[PDB]
Amino acid sequence: PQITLWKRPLVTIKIGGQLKEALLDTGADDTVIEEMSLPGRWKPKMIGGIGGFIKVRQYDQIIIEICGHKAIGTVLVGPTPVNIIGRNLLTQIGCTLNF
Amino acid sequence: PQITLWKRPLVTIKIGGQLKEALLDTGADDTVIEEMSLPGRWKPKMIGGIGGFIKVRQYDQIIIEICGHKAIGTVLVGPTPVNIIGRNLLTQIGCTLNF
Numbered sequence: 179p180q181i182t183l184w185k186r187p188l189v190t191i192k193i194g195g196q197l198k199e200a201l202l203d204t205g206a207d208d209t210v211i212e213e214m215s216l217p218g219r220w221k222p223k224m225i226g227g228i229g230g231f232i233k234v235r236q237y238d239q240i241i242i243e244i245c246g247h248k249a250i251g252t253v254l255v256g257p258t259p260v261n262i263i264g265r266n267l268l269t270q271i272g273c274t275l276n277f
Numbered sequence: 278p279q280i281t282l283w284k285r286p287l288v289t290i291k292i293g294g295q296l297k298e299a300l301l302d303t304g305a306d307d308t309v310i311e312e313m314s315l316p317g318r319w320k321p322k323m324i325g326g327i328g329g330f331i332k333v334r335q336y337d338q339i340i341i342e343i344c345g346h347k348a349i350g351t352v353l354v355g356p357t358p359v360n361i362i363g364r365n366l367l368t369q370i371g372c373t374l375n376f
């Protein structure tokens with residue numbers, strides 16, 4: 179679909195069989211999710227945002243449904259104020275910015 | 278134009294007579310620009326992001342040129358790692374998210 183930005187671009191995602199809400203963020207290189215249990219081993223990572231750096235756990239090859247679209251890639255888990263879907267998964271779903 | 282997300286969506290903007298690079302961020306409610314001089318009265322505010330909050334000065338009714346497009350609105354000035362154009366101004370230029 180086509181999404182305008184008068185409201186926050188929130189959508190529904192299915193991850194680990196759970197339904198959660200997430201923000202489509204073109205300014206984010208990566209995808210960051212709130213604390214939860216994902217399968218597999220993780221690797222450490224540190225990412226920067228508006229107010230400083232946070233430490234997260236990186237999981238590779240996680241399956242996620244975004245507005246019914248399937249994406250499979252890297253998900254970072256950490257202390258984020260909202261679930262963020264960033265560029266790494268937006269390109270998989272074919273998301274573009276138009277004006 | 279149509280912007281793909283394989284790379285960061287950075288664009289040239291004109292604010293206060295200076296030229297600058299900015300990131301188009303559909304996840305940001307507000308537009309936040311690196312410390313610079315703007316005319317007018319301002320009000321202090323705190324805005325939150327990944328990493329925590331930062332104190333910024335809020336200027337209203339500022340005119341910005343985004344990719345040759347004119348838009349008007351509130352601009353926050355502070356210690357941000359990157360210049361971010363948020364929804365407040367992306368709507369004014371007719372920017373949308375398509376998938």
Ligand SMILES: CCC[C@@]1(CCc2ccccc2)CC(O)=C([C@H](CC)c2cccc(NS(=O)(=O)c3ccc(C(F)(F)F)cn3)c2)C(=O)O1
Binds near residue numbers: 205305306325361
């Ligand atoms: C992983 C996130 C990437 C990003 C920082 C970008 C970056 C780019 C390259 C180099 C360094 C850093 C981009 C992002 O959208 C924000 C956030 C929202 C999650 C952000 C950005 C701009 C301003 C805000 N303050 S706010 O009041 O406009 C606000 C508050 C809350 C939210 C919510 F929608 F996330 F709740 C949105 N906006 C937030 C941020 O803090 O980090």
